[PDB]
Structure formats: C-alpha cells, structure tokens
Amino acid sequence: LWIRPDAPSRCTWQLGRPASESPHHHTAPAKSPKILPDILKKIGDTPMVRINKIGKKFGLKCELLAKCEFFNAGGSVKDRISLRMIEDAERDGTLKPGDTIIEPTSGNTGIGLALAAAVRGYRCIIVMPEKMSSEKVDVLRALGAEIVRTPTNARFDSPESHVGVAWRLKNEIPNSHILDQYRNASNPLAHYDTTADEILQQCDGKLDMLVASVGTGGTITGIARKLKEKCPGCRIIGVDPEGSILAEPEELNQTEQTTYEVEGIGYDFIPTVLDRTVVDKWFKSNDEEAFTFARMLIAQEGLLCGGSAGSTVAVAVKAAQELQEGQRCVVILPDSVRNYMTKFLSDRWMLQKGFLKEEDLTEKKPWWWHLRVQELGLSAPLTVLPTITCGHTIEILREKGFDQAPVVDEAGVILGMVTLGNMLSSLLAGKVQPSDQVGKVIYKQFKQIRLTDTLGRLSHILEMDHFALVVHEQIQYHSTGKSSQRQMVFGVVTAIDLLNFVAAQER
Amino acid sequence: LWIRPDAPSRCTWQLGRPASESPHHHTAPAKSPKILPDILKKIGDTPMVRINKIGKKFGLKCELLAKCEFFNAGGSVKDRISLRMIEDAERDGTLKPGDTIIEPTSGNTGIGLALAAAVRGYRCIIVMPEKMSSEKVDVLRALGAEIVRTPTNARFDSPESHVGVAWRLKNEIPNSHILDQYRNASNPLAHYDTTADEILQQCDGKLDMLVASVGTGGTITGIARKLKEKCPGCRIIGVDPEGSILAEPEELNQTEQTTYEVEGIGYDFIPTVLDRTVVDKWFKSNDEEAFTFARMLIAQEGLLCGGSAGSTVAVAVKAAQELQEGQRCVVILPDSVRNYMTKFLSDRWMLQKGFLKEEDLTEKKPWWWHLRVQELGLSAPLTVLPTITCGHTIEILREKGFDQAPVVDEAGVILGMVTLGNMLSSLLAGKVQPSDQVGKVIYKQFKQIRLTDTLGRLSHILEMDHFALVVHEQIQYHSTGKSSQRQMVFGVVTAIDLLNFVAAQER
Amino acid sequence: VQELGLSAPLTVLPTITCGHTIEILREKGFDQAPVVDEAGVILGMVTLGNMLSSLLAGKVQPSDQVGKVIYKQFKQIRLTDTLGRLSHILEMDHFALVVHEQIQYHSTGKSSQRQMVFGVVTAIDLLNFVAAQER
Ligand code: HEM
Ligand code: HEM
C-alpha cells in the first residue's frame, strides 16, 4: 500500500538523450510583467553576487560566485519546487480548489507550500521534524497552515517518521493529496527548467565548478543534468552534513552521530529523485565550520544567508583550491537568515552548544575587555525620592552642578533615573508643570550591574539599555531566623562614559 | 555647535520649477550588470504586487497595488537611502575609506548602513531607541556594527536622545561623521530619483492615489514631489501613529498616549526633510489596527511585511473608499517580517499587549476547540523501565497488542516513549542488537499535559513536540512535615489521535 | 464516568495523625483525601468533617493515627465504565474510587504492578453533574 520515498529511480534519462524524448511538460522561463498579479510570480530571476573577501582570505585564485537563492518570495530555495509542484498538480487535474495539501518537509518547502495555499485558498498541513527552528513554526502559524511534528531521530520508514505521519494523515483525512517533494519529478524539473537556465545565462555559458548542498536532491540533480547537457566542463560537487549517508563512496559516510544541527540538508535515506550518477565528488561538512562560515559570510559580505550556505562555502573553500586564475566557481546559498534568528546568529546559543569557545570570542576583543567596571570613576552622591516636585529637582541639581541622579524610595528600591536636560526640555515644551512629581519623567527602565563584572560584560549590557546602574546589595541578619536585605546605587555609566574612559586610558 | 534636526527646510524648490535648476547631483537609474559585483547592487527594482482579497473584503472598488520594498538587500525600504548617503558622502569627499560612521536611526537605516560599512570597510556605530526589537540588535551585532541605545521616552532635544547621543559621540571620537538621515538632502533624493521613477513607470503613470507611512519624511516627500511634477492628478496621503505630531492640521494630534508600539514611524519633532506642503491629507493609526492588518496581509496575501505595512493598509482601506472602479491606488510597505519574529507575529505577545482578544481568537476556531482533553479515549495500560532490552520490548508489545509504551524509571520520572515500528527499523538497520537496551531508541523529548486542559491547548502543544503525555500528580504525605510526590502517564495523545477523535465525532 | 469532574490532587498515609490531616485539608482547601500506603495500596477514605465530629465526641485524639477514622471499605471503578455502572456500584457502597492500573516490566519475565487514584465520586457528585448537564 504505502509507497516508500527510497524506491529506485524509474526515469529512463541518460546523458546525451535528445530533449524530444521528455515525457515531462517543460516550461520556458516566464517573462515577469511590469506588475505581477500575485506574489507567487516573484519566484526566480535571483541575482548572482561575486564574493570579494572569502576568496582572498583562503587562497582562491578563481572568481567565486554565489547564487543568492534566498531573495525569493518565501525566503528560500524551496520556493521554486513548491510553485512548480502546485502548477503541475493543477495542470494534471489532480488538485481541485479547496483540497487539503499535506507535505512532509524540513520547514523550507513548508513555508513555500503554505504561502501558495494561502494565496490560492488551499488548506495546508505541514509535517516537519522536531529540531526545526521555531521561527519556521511562527511563520507557518501566521500563514494559517496547520503544523504537526515528529521526533528528531525516528527512522525514515518508521510508523511515526515525518513521511510516515504524512502518509497516514493522507490516508485518514478525506480528499487530501501528498505532493511528495521526494519523489515528485516536478521537484528536480523545477530547477532543471528555471535555475539551471538562469545560472548559465548570467555567467554566460561558462563555469568551471559548481558547489551545492543536497537535501531532497532536486537542487543539485536538476542543475547538474542541464549543466552536463549544456556545459559538460563543470565539475559537480555535493555537500552533506556528517551523519547523513548521501555521499559516495561509502567510506566518506563512516561516522556514528546521527543528529546534526544544520537544518534542511542530509537524510538517513537516498531520495528517489537524487541522481548520484551526475555527481563527480562529495565532501562532508561538520557543524562548527558551517556556522562559522555562515557568520563570516554575514559579517564580511552582507549576505544574510543561513547555515546551509555556511556549509556550502566551507566546502567550496576546500574544493576550489584546484582551480586557477580565470576560472569560475559557483555556490548555491539556499535560505535566508530569517529562519535562524535564535540559532547561530545569536552568540548565546553558539556558546550554549559549544560551537564557539570562549577564547575565540574574547581573544580578538580590544585591550580594555578584561578590565573590571571598578576601574571607572563611578560616582552618584545624591538621590531623590520619586515624590519630589520637578522644580525642586531643577534647583537642587543645578545648585550642585549635577545633571542626573538615581531615584530611590525610602525602602531602598530603585525606580529608575532622571536627567536634568530632559526635565528642562519638558518644562520648555510644557509637558510637565514645575510642581509635578518626577515620577512622570523618570526613566523606568535600566540594567543592573556589579563591580566584579568586566567591561566586556558592561558593553554587552549597554547594547540592550542606555543606563547601567552599578549597585550593591547587603544582607542584614538579626538572629539567623529573622533577616533583611537592602541595596544601593554607586554611580551611573553609559556608552559615553565607557568610551571616554577608553579614550583617556589609551591616549 | 549642535545643528538641530528640526531646523526649517532651507530648500528653494517649489512645485513647477525646472529640475535643471537643482543644485543636487541627480543619478539616473541604470541596469546593473548580469552578475552583481557586491550585494549592495541588489537594491531597487522591487516588485509591485496586486492586492486581491484585502481590497474586496472592505468593498474597495478600485484596484489596489502595493510596492513591496522588503526585497532589498537589507530587507527594508531604508537600503536605498543608506546606499545613496554613502555614495554621496564619498563623492563629495567628506568620507574617506576607513573612517567611522555614527548614525542615529530607527534600526532599519541602522541595518542598511551597517551592511554598507561591512561590505565597504567602515567602522559603524548605531544609535537607536531602546524600545526597538532585539531582532534588529541581533542582525546588527552579526554584522559587527557597534550599538548604543537611548531611553524611549526622552525628548528629541534632551541630552540622551538618540539624535543627541549621536552628536556627543561624534564630537568625542575623532575622524567621525554623521550622515544625518533626517537633515541630509540625499535621503529624499534617493526616493525621488529611484522610487518615483520606478513607481510611475511600472503602472505607466496612470495612478490616482498614494499612501506611505511617514518616519524621517523622505519616504513620502521624495515620491510626492516627483509624482506632482509628472502627474499632479494623483493625491498624496500620509499616515502617522497616534502620539506623534507630524500630522496636520494640529487637531489630529490631540491625544495623550505618548509611547506607541509600531516601530520606526512618527516622531516627537518635525524632521527638517519632511516637506509637509506636499501631503494632501493625513490620518492617524493606532497599534491595534496596524497589527491586525499586518496579520491579515500575511495570512491572506503572503506579503511577509512588517507592522508599518499594516499601519499603511489600515489607512488605504479607509481613504480608497472615495475612489471608484478603474482608478488605481499604491501603498508603500516599508520592511520585512524578519524584524518582528518575536513581536506581533507571536500570538502570545499580541494577547499580552491586548491587541488580540480571546473572543476574536476562539470565535474563528472549530467546534471541538473548547472540549476537554478528558473527552479523548486516552489510555496507557503498560510501561517499561529504561533497562529492558530491545528484543523484550519487541516481543512484549506484540504479546499485549500495543505498539507504544511510556518509559518511566522506578522512581516515576518519565524519560520519554518508544514505539514498536521504530525498534523494528532500528533492528533492521543494525543500530541495536536485540540484547541492547531501549535507552538508545527512546524518543527523549515530549511535552507534559494535564487532564483539565482544553483541546485548544493540546493543539497548541502539538505544534512544538510530537508527543503530549497526559500525566497526573498525587502528593503523598506522612505527617504534614514530610511529603512525597509522584506522577504517572495516564495516556498518550498525538496529532493522529486528535484528528481521529475529531473525525469520529463529526461523522 | 470519564466525563465527570473527578479529581484527587493529594493523599496521605494511614499513619498520619488526625491533627495533621485536620490542618492539611483546610490548608489546601480539601475536605476528603485518599489514604494510601507507601507501596500504593489504597486503604480507604478520610473526611475532615468526620474527624472533627469524632474529636468533638472524644472518641479519638489529635495524636491518633487517621487509621481509626478512615472509611476502610469502598468500591472501585474505571474511566471506561458508564454512569449506569457507577450508579449500580453506588447502590452498595458510598465511595466509588476512579483508579488506574499499570504494569512496569523489566525483562518481560520480571514484572511489577502499581495503581493510583483518579478522583472520588458519590451520589452527590453524580446528581450535581446530572443537574448541571440537564440545565
Ligand atoms: C530528457 C528525456 C527524458 C526522458 C526520456 C524521461 C523519461 C521518464 C519517464 C518515462 C518517466 C516516468 C516513469 C514512471 O512514471 O514510472 C520519468 C520520470 C521521472 N523523470 Fe524523466 N525523462 C526525461 C527527462 C527528465 C529530466 C530532465 C529530469 C530532471 C532533471 C527527469 C527526472 C525524472 C524523475 C525524478 C522522475 C520520477 C522517477 C520516479 O518517480 O521514480 N526526467 N522520466
Ligand atoms: C529646482 C530644483 C531644486 C532646487 C532649485 C533646490 C534648491 C536647494 C538649495 C539651494 C538647497 C541648499 C539649501 C541650504 O544649503 O541651506 C537645497 C537643499 C535641499 N533640497 Fe533642494 N532643490 C531642488 C530640488 C530638490 C529635490 C528634488 C529634493 C528632494 C526630492 C530637494 C530636497 C532638498 C533637501 C531635503 C535639502 C536640504 C535642506 C536642509 O538640509 O535644510 N530639493 N535645495
């Protein structure tokens, strides 16, 4: 009954066969009109950007180009196959309006299918593994699609693998269809018809090597078939995270870990679509290099690309050592950074997973990084109760030369801070009467810091708040059964003060 | 010393003067090369996408078009002005390579300038209000630009306002510059040269209205001036959140709530560049309608646009009531959803801020939404210790006629679950010998639910973790001084079971 | 019976003193909790009002173990059971305990069994639920 995604390929295609033999309905690239009826037409025509600093930093003689595929409507390279599959299913008459579309996907195809369904009125149900980032979950909830999850490490053929769950859902809900991104020939055909033509028509029909990451296999197979038909000189390479078994020869695969952090690439089975015969070499990519290269891309070229692009460029910097001056290398950057905001893009998560060690984070920072906050000339002699009137603060502050003072209640609980200039400006604008209490103008937000913490911690705090209050806390005991506690402000500090201290010490 | 951003516009332009009199250097649009030398060339030529459902939902007779400006390199409509400002500063010789740029901005221009500096090699410092989302902070930190925050409720001319802290930092650090997105003539000129010529050329100049939220004021000034010079018949409509003083006549600004949730529009001072003589009408727009319309856009059209897009469509659905069939309207959607992933896109945050009300949420849900999970046929007759061997489980589950069983240690702490078919697949794959323990193949993650919760809570849980275990707690006491607690897995519920129950009840 | 408002958040050992139950039930808002041994065997029920009445009568002392006041006998029911079966059970005994049964295997040769209590129900609760549904 159930048809597996691991079935051997049944296509009769082989290199050199004339295009007339195709039983598939090829579509020539469509000319996007001046105004396009639906957002779905903004798929394709993506730009190719030459990398400038990664090439030199790692001894690349050749010109290195990146096919930025993450500027599509849904922000992924999985927006071509979704649209193409929907188009083919509608043209073949299988899909009627109002039907239910179930798709087992690693998120990226899910967003594309949900977008297409929302535009065209279909109901969409998405099944994706557990490890997918929560940003995809949020975007799918917003797009109105219904989500179902499956365990991280369930084997592909198990009753509760994402493919299996999708199958049983399709066999349970009435009038539903699984487009089956793994087996549907429209998947590789989408790239073979649109992506390959654009790649060859931008670089103008010549290129030495192509580097690509392999998930469902359409990305690489669809491009490679057209390239070998039209430009055989290209060396097709594939990337695959350490843990998945796509790569050949089997020796490359020998490792035990099965769960890897990079999302969207690598599988525990060989997809039906993937045509490994048109792949001339393979490399295995770990996670540390993938995330480091993603961060390096973001920070040195402005390409807001995800981790899979990091793996792609990390493999490219190795494979492309073979090339020489005048040669051209291409990388496919699948998806946008949007889906990884809480992941590697965040330093906290990187340290938590250990992909970046503390020495790597600290060794490059300026000289003053390890100085304690104690080294600053912090001082705040006076504090004002929140009930004091505006004019009282104006006179009391300008009489003593100060222009800002912490606000603390009699109990010692800090409420915020007040700046003389702000009160003066408000009075000039009439937003507060001189008799009005400071509670109306006090800044109610700030961050609390301690003496022992380094200036690096202070700088990482000031990126979130303006006023950092150096404070202290004292526990006051009575009998070991009756106790009390109190705290107090030392002196305000801001980016201005820290920068002035750095300038003074360094000069 | 300090030049205020509210200084009156010294420009001599008035509607009708020939452009040849302009003292500014105009740059005509041109076709970028087939491969972009660097990412920044992928700015402009963004698509105009027709709006289908939102227009009819409120009975708008006219055809409604949108200018999706969130496909720029930085994902915003503030990558045009950043590039233009950098280009003009370089052309006039003010900025030398290696100089430091400091810019007070509402994030979006911050991201654009940080990207430009990262690509072209400048040290960049961004000053932004404290209230802006941490998504922009993360994207900036990844790009390497330093960040400084300011209190949200500080008056524009106070010492610690962003436009003030920027000035103080500029006076402090040597060889530093402020491009001043507020005063600089490049800001409006960018849109006047690129955006307007794109708009009036895409739709062939036959448009009747335009809507564009107002921040710095360039967005509307630069487009309205060119539209009136080319096609004065088109009305120009601004927008502004309640609590800002940009709208005229003054009576529209009469409201008392200062802070507002929408990010990046509306200011407590009139920007020098904001040419209010070319704004034919004004509206206000609170936060509730802004976010509601943003969510409606995402769900019903697929335009992954941010809050300001909602604040603009909420006004366009009012103003466009005056048009009739045949006429055309244009809206300007500033930024992408990428900046608000944890904000309005999150239902929890919307409910917390009160923009969503439980009635509007539940009234859309199906009938079974409010039923208790207690109504399901949940059950869990057996369980196993983690030490049991794989073969023992394989035989015992088939003996008892089940397929999955909770795994709980003797102390009652639940470890996870395990399923028959997954063990069979593991045995076939050799990952476990029959003598091996189930600790290898257990699904080590799940979410805990209680009998009282409604099926809506269960459906929200199932979007994150596959297995929802219906646990129960009994606290066992001995003398009111010694206490003990334990829990057990009454039943296991998954999306499949929920759908089965729904179908059975419905049929 | 799975559709009733059954519940039983906490329970006590029979060895707990009468005063301890007296204080705990009012402390946490309950009036009757199951009495269960350390191994999980259900002995019976105890009620706050009955403890108070017996203390007033002088038949027990606050230091006395609740084992004296427990309602040592009852009948047992399961979720699948219909309300009709619950009514038939209540015709013979006051307390009907909704309980659970589980088997915790170790090697498919070695096995152990344990049980716990869902909640309590009486004619009062049954009639209250009937009225609440009828209205
Ligand atoms: C150019 C001449 C081609 C011929 C003669 C050919 C032949 C066929 C035929 C007859 C089938 C149907 C098999 C079935 O229904 O069981 C098929 C399916 C398929 N074709 Fe082609 N094809 C051609 C081009 C292509 C191209 C260009 C691609 C991709 C770039 C492609 C990928 C596929 C895939 C993935 C399937 C589905 C295999 C499966 O479902 O197991 N084919 N092909
Ligand atoms: C006939 C065409 C124009 C003329 C004669 C003209 C004239 C001028 C002059 C003389 C200045 C310098 C003012 C000063 O230094 O104080 C100026 C600045 C400026 N112009 Fe124009 N301009 C023209 C077109 C435009 C256009 C097309 C735009 C925008 C789309 C524009 C917006 C501005 C702005 C924002 C400033 C800066 C004002 C300030 O910073 O205070 N002008 N213009």
Residue numbers in the entry:
A (entry chain E), B (entry chain F): 42 to 548
C (entry chain G): 414 to 548
The authors write:
Cystathionine beta-synthase (CBS) is an essential metabolic enzyme across all domains of life for the production of glutathione, cysteine, and hydrogen sulfide. Human CBS adopts a unique multi-domain structure: an N-terminal haem binding domain (residues 38–74), a central PLP-dependent catalytic domain (CD, residues 75–382), and a C-terminal regulatory domain (RD, residues 411–551)5,11,12. The RD adopts the evolutionarily conserved Bateman module, consisting of two tandem CBS motifs (CBS-1 and CBS-2) and a surface-exposed loop (residues 516–525) extending from a CBS-2 motif. Here we show using cryo-electron microscopy that full-length human CBS in the basal and SAM-bound activated states polymerises as filaments mediated by a conserved regulatory domain loop.
We pursued the cryo-EM structure of full-length CBS initially using two constructs: one where an N-terminal His-tag was removed during purification (CBSFL) and one with a permanent C-terminal His-tag (CBSFL-CHis). Multiple maps were processed using both helical and single particle reconstruction to resolutions of between 3.9 and 3.0 Å. Both constructs resulted in maps with virtually identical conformations, and both were used for modelling. The domain-swapped dimer, previously observed in crystal structures, is the repeating unit, and helical formation is driven by inter-dimeric RD interactions, i.e., between the RDs of neighbouring subunits of the filament. Specifically, one RD each from two neighbouring CBS dimers interact in a butterfly-like dimeric arrangement, related by C2 symmetry, such that the loop 516–525 from an RD of one dimer forms a clasp around an RD of the neighbouring dimer. This packing arrangement, burying a total surface area of ~1550 Å2, is stabilised through two interfaces composed entirely of the RDs. The second interface involves inter-dimeric RD contacts, between the two neighbouring CBS-2 motifs. Here RD residues Leu419, Leu492, Met529, and Phe531 of one dimeric subunit form hydrophobic packing interactions with the equivalent residues of the neighbouring dimeric subunit. Altogether, the two sites of RD interactions demonstrate how loop 516–525 is the main driver of CBS oligomerisation. Though both full-length CBS constructs resulted in highly similar filament maps, one key difference was the observed protein degradation and the presence of slightly shorter oligomers of the CBSFL construct without a permanent His-tag.
